[PDB]
PDB file of C-alpha atoms in Angstrom:
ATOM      1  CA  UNK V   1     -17.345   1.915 -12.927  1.00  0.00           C
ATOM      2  CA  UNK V   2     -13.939   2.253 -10.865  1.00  0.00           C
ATOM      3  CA  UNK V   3     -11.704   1.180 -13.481  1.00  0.00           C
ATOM      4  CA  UNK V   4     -10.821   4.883 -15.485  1.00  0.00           C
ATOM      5  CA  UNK V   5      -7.873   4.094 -17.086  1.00  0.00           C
ATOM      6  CA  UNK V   6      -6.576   0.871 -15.242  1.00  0.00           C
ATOM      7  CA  UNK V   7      -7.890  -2.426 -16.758  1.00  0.00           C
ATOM      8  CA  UNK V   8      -5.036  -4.198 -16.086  1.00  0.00           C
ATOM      9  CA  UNK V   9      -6.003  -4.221 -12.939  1.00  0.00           C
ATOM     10  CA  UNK V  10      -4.340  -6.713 -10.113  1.00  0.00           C
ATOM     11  CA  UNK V  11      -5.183  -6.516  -5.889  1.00  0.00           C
ATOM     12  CA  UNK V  12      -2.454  -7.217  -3.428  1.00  0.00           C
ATOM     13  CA  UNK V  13      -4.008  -8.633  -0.645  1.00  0.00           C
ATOM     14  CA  UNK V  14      -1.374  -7.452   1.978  1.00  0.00           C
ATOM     15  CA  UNK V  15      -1.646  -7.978   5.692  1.00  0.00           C
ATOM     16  CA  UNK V  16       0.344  -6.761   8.644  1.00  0.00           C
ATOM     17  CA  UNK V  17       0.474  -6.997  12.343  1.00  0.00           C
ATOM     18  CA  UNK V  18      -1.415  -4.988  14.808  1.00  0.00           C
ATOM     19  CA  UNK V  19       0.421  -2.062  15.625  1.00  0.00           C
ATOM     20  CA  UNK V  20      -2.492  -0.492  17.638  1.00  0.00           C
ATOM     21  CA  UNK V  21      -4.852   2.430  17.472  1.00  0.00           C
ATOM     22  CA  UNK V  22      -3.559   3.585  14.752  1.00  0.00           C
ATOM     23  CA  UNK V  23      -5.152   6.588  12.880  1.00  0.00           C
ATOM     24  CA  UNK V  24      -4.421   5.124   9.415  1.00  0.00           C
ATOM     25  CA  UNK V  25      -2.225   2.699   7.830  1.00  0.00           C
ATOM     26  CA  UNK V  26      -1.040   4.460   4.472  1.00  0.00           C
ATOM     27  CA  UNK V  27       0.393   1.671   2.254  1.00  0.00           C
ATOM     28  CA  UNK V  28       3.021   3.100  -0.165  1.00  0.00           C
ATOM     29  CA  UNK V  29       3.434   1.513  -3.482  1.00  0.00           C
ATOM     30  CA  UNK V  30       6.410   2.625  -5.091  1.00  0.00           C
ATOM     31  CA  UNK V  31       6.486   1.630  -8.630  1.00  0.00           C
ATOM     32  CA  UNK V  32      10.064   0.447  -9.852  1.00  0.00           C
ATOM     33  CA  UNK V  33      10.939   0.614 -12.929  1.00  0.00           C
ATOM     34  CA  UNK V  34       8.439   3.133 -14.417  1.00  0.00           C
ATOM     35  CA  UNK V  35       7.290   6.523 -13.786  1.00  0.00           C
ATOM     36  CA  UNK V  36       4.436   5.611 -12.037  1.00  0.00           C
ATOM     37  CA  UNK V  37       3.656   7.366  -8.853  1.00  0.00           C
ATOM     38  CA  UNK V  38       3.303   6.106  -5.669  1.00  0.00           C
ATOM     39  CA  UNK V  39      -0.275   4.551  -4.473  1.00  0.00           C
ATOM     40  CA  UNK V  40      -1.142   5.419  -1.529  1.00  0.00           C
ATOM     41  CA  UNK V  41      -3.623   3.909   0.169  1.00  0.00           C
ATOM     42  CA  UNK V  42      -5.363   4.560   3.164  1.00  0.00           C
ATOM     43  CA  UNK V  43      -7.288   2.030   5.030  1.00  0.00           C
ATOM     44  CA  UNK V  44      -8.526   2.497   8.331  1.00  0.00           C
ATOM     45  CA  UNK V  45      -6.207   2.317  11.630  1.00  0.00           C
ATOM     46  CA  UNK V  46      -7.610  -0.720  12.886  1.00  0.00           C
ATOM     47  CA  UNK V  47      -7.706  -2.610   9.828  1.00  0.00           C
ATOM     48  CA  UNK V  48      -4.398  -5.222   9.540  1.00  0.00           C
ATOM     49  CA  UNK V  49      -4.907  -5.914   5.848  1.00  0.00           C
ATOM     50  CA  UNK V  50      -5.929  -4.611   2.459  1.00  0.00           C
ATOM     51  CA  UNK V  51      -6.966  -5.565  -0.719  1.00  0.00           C
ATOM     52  CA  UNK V  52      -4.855  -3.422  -3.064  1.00  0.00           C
ATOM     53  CA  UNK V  53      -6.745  -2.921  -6.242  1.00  0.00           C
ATOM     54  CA  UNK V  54      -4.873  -0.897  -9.383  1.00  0.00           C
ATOM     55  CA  UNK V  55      -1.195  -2.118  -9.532  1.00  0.00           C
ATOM     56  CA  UNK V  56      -0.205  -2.189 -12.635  1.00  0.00           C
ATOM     57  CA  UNK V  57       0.655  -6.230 -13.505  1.00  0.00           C
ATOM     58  CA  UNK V  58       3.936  -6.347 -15.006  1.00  0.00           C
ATOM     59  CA  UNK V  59       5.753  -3.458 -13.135  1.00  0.00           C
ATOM     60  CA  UNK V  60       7.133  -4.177  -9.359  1.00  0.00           C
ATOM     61  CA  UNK V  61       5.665  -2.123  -6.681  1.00  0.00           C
ATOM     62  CA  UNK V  62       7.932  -1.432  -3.275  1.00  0.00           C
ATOM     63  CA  UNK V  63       4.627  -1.620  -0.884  1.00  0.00           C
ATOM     64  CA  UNK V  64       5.253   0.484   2.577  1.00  0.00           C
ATOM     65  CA  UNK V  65       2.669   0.736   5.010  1.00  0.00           C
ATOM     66  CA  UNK V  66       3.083   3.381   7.460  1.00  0.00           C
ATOM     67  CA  UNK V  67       1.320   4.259  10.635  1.00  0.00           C
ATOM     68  CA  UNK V  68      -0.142   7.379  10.833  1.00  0.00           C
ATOM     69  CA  UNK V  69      -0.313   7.504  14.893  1.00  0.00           C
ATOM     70  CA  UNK V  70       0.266  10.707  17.102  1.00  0.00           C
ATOM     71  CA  UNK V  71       0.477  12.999  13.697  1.00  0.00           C
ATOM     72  CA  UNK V  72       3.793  10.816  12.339  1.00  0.00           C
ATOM     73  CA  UNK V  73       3.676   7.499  10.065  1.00  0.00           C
ATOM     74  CA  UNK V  74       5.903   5.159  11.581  1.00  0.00           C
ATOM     75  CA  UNK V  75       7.319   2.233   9.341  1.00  0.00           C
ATOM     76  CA  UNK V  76       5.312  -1.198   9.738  1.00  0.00           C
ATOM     77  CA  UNK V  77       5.851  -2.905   6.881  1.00  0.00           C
ATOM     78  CA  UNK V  78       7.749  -2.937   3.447  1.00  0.00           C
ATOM     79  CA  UNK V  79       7.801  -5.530   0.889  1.00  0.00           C
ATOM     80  CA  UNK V  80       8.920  -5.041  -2.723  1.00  0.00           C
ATOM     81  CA  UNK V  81       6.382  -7.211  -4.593  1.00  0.00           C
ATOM     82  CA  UNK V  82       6.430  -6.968  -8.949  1.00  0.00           C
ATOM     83  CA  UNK V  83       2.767  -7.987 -10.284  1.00  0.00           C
ATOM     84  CA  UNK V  84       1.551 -10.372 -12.403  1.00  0.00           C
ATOM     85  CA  UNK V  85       3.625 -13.835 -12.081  1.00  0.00           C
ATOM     86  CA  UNK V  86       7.335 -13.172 -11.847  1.00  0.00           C
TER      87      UNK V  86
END
């Protein structure tokens, strides 16, 4: 079990340079489109990639990671990415 709601379940493998010692990278999805809320996802603030698992195939996702380093999340990344095969 994982899956509570979300079967339609697709990963975004996204992966971004090193921006060192970071405290955590929180990766924004912003769903476009719907009314979906934001995933955030927190991976650890070494880690320079992450296997997104829950968006939603079929709506787009604006994915932000930020870098939570000296209390503030700095911008490292942002892609707008729609899921599925479109």
């Amino acid at each position: 079990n994982a899956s509570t709601g979300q079967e339609a379940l697709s990963q975004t493998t996204i992966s971004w340079a090193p921006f060192q010692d970071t405290s955590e990278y929180i990766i924004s999805c912003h769903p476009v489109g719907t009314d979906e809320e934001p995933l955030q996802f927190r991976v650890p603030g070494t880690s320079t990639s992450a296997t997104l698992t829950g968006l939603t195939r079929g709506a787009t996702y604006n994915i932000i990671v930020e870098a939570l380093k000296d209390q503030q999340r700095h911008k490292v990344r942002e892609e707008v990415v729609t899921v599925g095969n479109s």
